[PDB]
C-alpha cells in the first residue's frame, strides 16, 4: 500500500531543534508543512548515514504499522541520505520521564505502562515482526497514559544489555527475545530508570548470565512482579512468557495496583 508512506520534499519540513544524538545519526524535532495545507505538524526527523550500497521497502512496513502503541512511520525523504518523518511525542521517551518524576510515579502508571507495551509487542508479534531493541529508551511518551514503541525497523553498538542470552552468543532474534528485552525495559521502569549491570562492561554480560546472575529485585517490586520478569530472563526462549500472557497478567495487576507494587505515598 503506497500511500501509507508519503514521499516528502525538502521543502515541506524543517529541523528546528536537536533532540539526541548517536553513531546512528540525529533525531531533530521539526515542523512539517505539508505544501496545500497551511498546518504546521510537530514532527521528529532521524537523518541516516549514508548508505555505501531496500530501506523504502523496510520503510513501507514501518508506514503500515497500524497500532496505538507502536510509532507509525509518517513519511520519508530520499536523497543521497534518507530521513525519516514520524509524529513527535512531546513527553519524550519513558526512560527519562521515569528518571525526572521519580518522586510522584505511581504503581497505577507503571502497570499500565506495561501493559502498553505488551499491548504494541503482541501486535507486533502478530505482523510476524521483530522488533530487535525494545529498551526504556525506545519507549516514547505521547501523553502520561499513552506511550509508543518507538525505533522499529531501524534493525534492517550492539545492545549488549537488553539482548537475551542465545541473541548474545547465537545471534538468534525471535519473538522470545523480544520477551526477554522486555524484562529488561520492565526493570528500567521499576527502579525509575537505573541502569542495567551498571559497571560490568559489555564483555562479561554473557558470563555472568551464563553463571545464573541477572538483574536484582527492584525494591517497590513483590515477588509477584518480580517472578515475571525472572521468567523473561530463562535461557530456554520457550519458557518465557508469551506478550500475549504478559498483557493478561499485567492488566490483572493494573486492577489492584497497590497490591503488586509498594511505591511510598502510592
Ligand atoms: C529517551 C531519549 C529520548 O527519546 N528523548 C526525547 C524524545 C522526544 N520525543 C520524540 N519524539 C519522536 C521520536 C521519533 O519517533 O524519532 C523517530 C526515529 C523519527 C523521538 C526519538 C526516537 N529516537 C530513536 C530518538 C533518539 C534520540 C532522541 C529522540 C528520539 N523522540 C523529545 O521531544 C521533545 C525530547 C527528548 N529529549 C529532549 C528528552 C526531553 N527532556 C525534557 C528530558
Not at 505521547?142 to 514503541?149: E, L, S, Y
Not at 551464563?210 to 512482579?225: A, F, M, N, S, Y
Request: proline share 5%.
Amino acid at each position: 500500500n503506497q500511500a501509507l508512506l508519503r514521499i516528502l520534499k525538502e521543502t515541506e519540513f524543517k529541523k528546528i531543534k536537536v533532540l539526541g544524538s548517536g553513531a546512528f545519526g540525529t533525531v531533530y524535532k521539526g515542523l512539517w508543512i505539508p505544501e496545500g495545507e497551511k498546518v504546521k505538524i510537530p514532527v521528529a526527523i532521524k537523518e541516516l548515514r549514508e548508505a555505501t550500497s531496500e530501506i523504502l521497502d523496510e520503510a513501507y512496513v514501518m508506514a503500515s504499522v497500524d497500532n496505538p502503541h507502536v510509532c507509525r512511520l509518517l513519511g520519508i525523504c530520499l536523497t543521497s541520505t534518507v530521513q525519516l518523518i514520524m509524529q513527535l511525542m512531546p513527553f519524550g521517551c519513558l526512560l527519562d520521564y521515569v528518571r525526572e518524576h521519580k518522586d510522584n510515579i505511581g504503581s497505577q502508571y507503571l502497570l499500565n505502562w506495561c501493559v502498553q507495551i505488551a499491548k504494541g509487542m503482541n501486535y507486533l508479534e502478530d505482523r510476524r515482526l521483530v522488533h530487535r531493541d525494545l529498551a526504556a529508551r525506545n519507549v516514547l511518551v505521547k501523553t502520561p497514559q499513552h506511550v509508543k514503541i518507538t525505533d522499529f525497523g531501524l534493525a534492517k553498538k550492539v545492545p549488549i544489555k537488553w539482548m537475551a542470552l542465545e541473541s548474545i552468543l547465537h545471534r538468534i532474534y525471535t519473538h522470545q527475545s523480544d520477551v526477554w528485552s522486555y524484562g529488561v525495559t520492565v526493570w528500567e521502569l521499576m527502579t525509575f530508570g537505573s541502569k542495567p549491570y551498571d559497571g560490568i562492561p559489555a564483555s562479561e554480560i554473557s558470563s555472568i548470565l551464563e553463571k545464573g546472575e541477572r538483574l536484582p529485585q527492584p525494591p517497590i517490586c513483590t515477588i509477584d512482579v518480580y517472578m515475571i520478569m525472572r521468567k523473561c530472563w530463562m535461557i530456554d526462549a520457550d519458557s518465557r512468557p508469551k506478550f500475549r500472557e504478559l498483557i493478561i497478567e499485567f492488566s490483572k495487576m493494573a486492577r489492584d495496583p497497590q497490591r503488586y507494587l509498594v511505591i511510598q505515598g502510592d
